């Protein structure tokens, strides 16, 4: 369900986008705006802008569109008279859930639960997903320390005024290069770009190095083992050190592939050993699959590649999943209500969409497709790397979750700008990487279409 | 548009709710669930549950349903073919807004901008609204201090690893009794109930007393003035104290009426003077209208009662507004992009609904209606207070934003439970208060429906 290919009329942003950008800039800083879109005319992998340009979208709204624009199955959903209520009657889900709440969850999120995690709480975005995952971990850790006993009077009084022992000085360990969100808890575990962090108060929490692999992988096996081993050791040293500082690490958060920090990969071995280190020190292992989740790596959750029956304690998600939330082990279930809570806790209308999305992913075998189409894309990227080593390096990926580096930021930006005017939307990450986040209806021939367009771009560059 | 009265079939929760609650409790702690709802049959002021009970809803999903259930105008929006894309193609608004983004904002949020605030950023909930308001304020304050100097190399370095000077030790001043959300920045400014705070790490930020008025107001004129004056003094002393601690107060956050902490009111004079204190010390004045905003006090924003051309620097909202976000003064506009940002920044489908909600609020004169229906409700509560002083005290309100105290938490809960079985849904707040948050289609006759039901309950209690 889509178009024959891209179709360009103007440079991007064109005159109509620039006019709208001017208008928007009156009421807010609109410098980040790429262009304005005609979503009504957008279909599948193709995004249409207000100047009528039709572009192959390989960025998919920062990796948040699961099965393409204007998907017919979703159109049908909105058209059904029985579904009107779900769009106009938003519940305070924590206290007054709709009749079909549990059954819709069975049809969607529960049908793709990670191994070992029977519990699920929903949230509206990745940031509150992670924030509440932190809180779940903090109260679990305190539960271990206090055992089956009541809150003390001192705890109940001091927590109201932001003081210990009611408010503990627990920490969450994160990695350099990580991105976990922008609210002030999330942000403390984020180490992506200075502009995300500067001028905002933070937490003194431990920050570990994330492995920086050397490419091609075939030539640096030993170097890369040594790099991962070094990082694992520093993780353990940090845990020990912060326990001594009386800032006990209650949890470790990591992405299976670091996105905003520059598509940084690491071996499955690294993550298995990281999981073990976490368990060994009594740390909750929190896997952030807000961006890797939803199938683009070839399996529904990227951590599935690790092949563990006990992959993690908590796993957050959002973006492609339409709603946010987190799965977790039964032992992390809050002991009392109103500790993990907010007004909306997601939105049943997003669950409605998600059930149909998961139905499409399964019926059309889109996990296999992502593996296959991703192989085609990565193969082509390796070929272009060979042919253009002065522009392309560190080609890397899993499924369609691929990326490469350019010599510098200006070349990176120029390549994105040229590709866009040629009908292909690409994302950047880090200071000089280009990344791919195609929707799940991205096929072989889209990979070939991109590769052939980019090939001629490089030839003329 | 509405039913004509409650109709009860069973106890609440009834057998079908209890069954669904048992199912949900398998996958998560479901102890907060009141009952399960049939939103398809709910209409106007009435919530229908899965056991067929029809209740007059005076709690409105924690004050978040603006013009009642299944409003025919919202029904017709979802039925329009041209609106289908808005519900199934959700954009990364910060980079790729839809063509109609600015116009739909003109039809909705911009048409009710607070005085003096030309800027608007949208967010998906109250918590990230407040979080990003804090961040806007921190960046503004730092910008004041560094003048036209650029980011120092040291700041750019240290901010990446959660260290000063890149991460300043700025504080937000908040009030005892406040509720501003659940994410870790918000939570530090929240001082509502211990169960919201316990076992979660916090910030050492200043906490001021919020005035506790004495009732009847007419008999405590001098006392209430002195109480408010005392609280103002303690605020100013805190700002000074924390400047010395090198934890400079960059902003002050306050609710025009404290909700979760027990519907605590203060005079318009108090807030005007608090605003003056904020400006005097160069603190941003942040008004949280997430719960007071959207008309139930008789004015669209509760701070409008204060009568100021310059009521605040930043004002956050959510709930009735369908979307969250914050308005702010031009001088608080972020200097660079990607500092206030996240994946979705709200949802255009909420803006679509909100434009129609605001149209209805204006055409049906619902601000004035809330002032009237609220006066009728308050008058009846005062009658019940006079007749039942063993149970009812401190009756108070503005518009339909009303409340009263009971003798203890046990009685508070019993009255709510009995009212519900008698066909009226009430909310609690604080330790022993009962509150009202009726939808904006709550009329004087609904006030009398409630009052007659509750009169009978009190006579038999
Ligand atoms: C791994 C990971 N964890 C958490 C988040 C936060 O999700 P949202 O709060 O934006 O929904 C994200 C969101 N992605 C994202 C990429 S850049 C953008 C930003 O805020 O600048 C946000 C994520 O990729
Ligand atoms: C004045 C005020 N400020 C901020 C918020 C946070 O909004 P949400 O994050 O819940 O959307 C709220 C939300 N209201 C609310 C009432 S109790 C509930 C909770 O989390 O327990 C949340 C609010 O009333
Ligand atoms: S923090 Fe997730 S929607 Fe506001």
From Swiss-Prot, chains A, B:
Catalytic activity: 4-aminobutanoate + 2-oxoglutarate = succinate semialdehyde + L-glutamate; (S)-3-amino-2-methylpropanoate + 2-oxoglutarate = 2-methyl-3-oxopropanoate + L-glutamate
Modified residue annotations for N6-succinyllysine: 193, 214, 375
This enzyme's EC code(s): 2.6.1.19, 2.6.1.22
Annotated binding of substrate, by residue: 182
Cell location: Mitochondrion matrix
SUPFAM superfamilies reported in the protein's UniProt record: PLP-dependent transferases (SSF53383)
Enzyme class: transferase
Residues that bear N6-(pyridoxal phosphate)lysine: 319
Positions bearing N6-acetyllysine: 214, 241, 280, 375, 414, 432
Known role: Catalyzes the conversion of gamma-aminobutyrate and L-beta-aminoisobutyrate to succinate semialdehyde and methylmalonate semialdehyde, respectively. Can also convert delta-aminovalerate and beta-alanine.
Protein name: 4-aminobutyrate aminotransferase, mitochondrial
Annotated source species: Sus scrofa
């Amino acid at each position: 369900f889509d178009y024959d290919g891209p179709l360009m009329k103007t440079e991007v942003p064109g005159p109509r986008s620039r006019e709208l950008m001017k208008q928007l800039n009156i009421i807010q800083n609109a410098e980040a705006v790429h262009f304005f879109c005609n979503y009504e005319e957008s279909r599948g992998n193709y995004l249409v802008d207000v100047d009528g340009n039709r572009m192959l979208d390989l960025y998919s709204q920062i990796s948040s569109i699961p099965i393409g624009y204007s998907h017919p199955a979703l159109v049908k959903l909105v058209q059904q008279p029985q579904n009107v209520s779900t769009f106009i009657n938003r519940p305070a889900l924590g206290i007054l859930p709709p009749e079909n709440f549990v059954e819709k969850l069975r049809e969607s999120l529960l049908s793709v639960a990670p191994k070992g995690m029977s519990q699920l709480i929903t949230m509206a975005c990745g940031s509150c997903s992670n924030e509440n995952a932190f809180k779940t971990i903090f109260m679990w850790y305190r539960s271990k320390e206090r055992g089956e006993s009541a809150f003390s009077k001192e705890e109940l009084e001091t927590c109201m005024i932001n003081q210990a022992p009611g408010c503990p000085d627990y920490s969450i360990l994160s990695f350099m290069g990580a991105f976990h969100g922008r609210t002030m808890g999330c942000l403390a575990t984020t180490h992506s770009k200075a502009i995300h962090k500067i001028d905002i108060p933070s937490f003194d929490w431990p920050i570990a190095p994330f492995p920086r692999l050397k490419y091609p992988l075939e030539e640096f096996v030993k170097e890369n083992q040594q790099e991962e081993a070094r990082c694992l050791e520093e993780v353990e040293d940090l845990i020990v050190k912060y326990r001594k500082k009386k800032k006990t690490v209650a949890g470790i958060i990591v992405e299976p592939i670091q996105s905003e920090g520059g598509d940084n990969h690491a071996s499955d071995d690294f993550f298995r050993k990281l999981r073990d280190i976490s368990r060994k020190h009594g740390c909750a292992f929190l896997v952030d699959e807000v961006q890797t989740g939803g199938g683009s790596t070839g399996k529904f959750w990227a951590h599935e590649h690790w092949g563990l029956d006990d992959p993690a304690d908590v796993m957050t998600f959002s973006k492609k999943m339409m709603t946010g939330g987190f799965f977790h082990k039964e032992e992390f279930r809050p002991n009392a209500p109103y500790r993990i809570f907010n007004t909306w806790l997601g939105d049943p209308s997003k669950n409605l969409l998600l059930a149909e999305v998961i139905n499409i992913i399964k019926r059309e075998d889109l996990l296999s497709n992502a593996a296959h189409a991703g192989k085609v894309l990565l193969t082509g990227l390796l070929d272009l790397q060979a042919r253009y080593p002065q522009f392309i390096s560190r080609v890397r990926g899993r499924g369609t979750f691929c990326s490469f580096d350019t010599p510098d930021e200006s070349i990176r930006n120029k390549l994105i700008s040229i590709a866009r005017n040629k009908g292909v939307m690409l994302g950047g990450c880090g200071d000089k990487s280009i990344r791919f986040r195609p929707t799940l209806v991205f096929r072989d021939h889209h990979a070939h279409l991109f590769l052939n367009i980019f090939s001629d771009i490089l030839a003329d560059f």
